[PDB]
Amino acid sequence: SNPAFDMKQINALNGHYQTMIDNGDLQCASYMMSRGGEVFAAESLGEFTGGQKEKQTFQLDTIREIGALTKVFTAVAVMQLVEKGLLDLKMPVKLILPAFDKPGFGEIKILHLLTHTAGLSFELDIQKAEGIDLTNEEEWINYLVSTPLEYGVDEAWNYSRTGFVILGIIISKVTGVSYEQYVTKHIIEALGLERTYFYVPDTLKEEVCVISEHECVQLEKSHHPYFPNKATSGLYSSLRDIWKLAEMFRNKGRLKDKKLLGRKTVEAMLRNQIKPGLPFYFFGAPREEGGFGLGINLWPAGDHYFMTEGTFSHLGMGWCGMFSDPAEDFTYVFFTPISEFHPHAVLTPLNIVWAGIELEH
Numbered sequence: 001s002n003p004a005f006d007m008k009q010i011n012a013l014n015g016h017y018q019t020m021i022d023n024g025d026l027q028c029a030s031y032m033m034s035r036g037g038e039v040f041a042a043e044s045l046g047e048f049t050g051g052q053k054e055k056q057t058f059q060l061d062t063i064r065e066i067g068a069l070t071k072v073f074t075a076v077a078v079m080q081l082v083e084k085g086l087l088d089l090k091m092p093v094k095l096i097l098p099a100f101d102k103p104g105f106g107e108i109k110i111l112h113l114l115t116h117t118a119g120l121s122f123e124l125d126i127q128k129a130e131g132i133d134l135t136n137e138e139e140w141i142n143y144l145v146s147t148p149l150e151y152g153v154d155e156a157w158n159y160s161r162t163g164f165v166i167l168g169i170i171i172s173k174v175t176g177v178s179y180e181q182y183v184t185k186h187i188i189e190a191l192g193l194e195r196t197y198f199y200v201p202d203t204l205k206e207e208v209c210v211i212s213e214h215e216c217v218q219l220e221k222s223h224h225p226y227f228p229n230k231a232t233s234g235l236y237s238s239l240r241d242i243w244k245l246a247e248m249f250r251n252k253g254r255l256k257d258k259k260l261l262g263r264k265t266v267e268a269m270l271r272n273q274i275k276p277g278l279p280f281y282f283f284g285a286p287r288e289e290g291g292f293g294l295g296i297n298l299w300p301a302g303d304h305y306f307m308t309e310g311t312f313s314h315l316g317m318g319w320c321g322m323f324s325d326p327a328e329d330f331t332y333v334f335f336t337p338i339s340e341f342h343p344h345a346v347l348t349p350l351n352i353v354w355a356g357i358e359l360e361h
């Protein structure tokens, strides 16, 4: 075995996905895994439909929205601006966005937004914004700072989509271009992603995986339905492109001749940035404590999980995910389109994949 992987776990992995597709849980599924930067196993299963067209075959290069995985693109963009000297992680947000110059918001720093410790709630409610344009940058900011904060800074890890929308606004301010234009040129094109778009062109729109009508409606829209940018969600991508992003991190910023970050910067992003003893919250409910870097998740890893300590990851509704084990030079990315979450459908295959890892040779 050149990649040193027990290929019977591939059969167990395919059968696990194929069982849920035959039971009606999943419509389709796809994955891709690599050892030492070389993909040795990749499969696509099932069919998809948005409820109108007939069923199309799910493919390995099928484009699909990655949801919260867009946050990793935003994190790279922020850390690039730090490498250039235009941003600092300890910068108070009120320095760039003077609307934050008020009690509570005045102590929110860029480090707090990257690590979900800025005290912001999960999201802004849109029913109270009647009369104001939620997708306007100037309007959305004033409505945010007119809403009370959940906690003060450094009080708890609270996953917030609002936090990364602000980062996309800060990126737009210090660069002179929009967040979408910056990420497209300095990340998407600089890394060589061939099937990654903030907005899918018309000629490729028929090859986008959609499992609901509201996914097809959003497919033809030119802006996020209620955010001034797409820094928290809204990126369409493929398995190979998500695999390239994970491999860029495992190689500490390089993908052969493509360089996105410095070696020392990625080492900072993969370090635990949360104060000890802080409580964790995801969607109001408590969560199990875990490491978290500069926009990168260091949990789950170790403990009862098979993933080695130091494995970094990030999930996204869809569902989707990328998992990279630096100790094993191993990477696993997957697409599991489903309208909600279920760990048996999303996180159980992690036990199957890592149980096949043999000693690298």
Ligand SMILES: CC(=O)NCCSC(=O)CCC(=O)O
Pocket (backbone or CB within 6 Å): 067, 068, 069, 159, 161, 232, 233, 282, 297, 314, 315, 316, 317
């Ligand atoms: C940090 C953690 O535990 N889960 C984050 C991935 S869940 C997701 O997709 C949130 C919805 C979104 O912002 O698109």
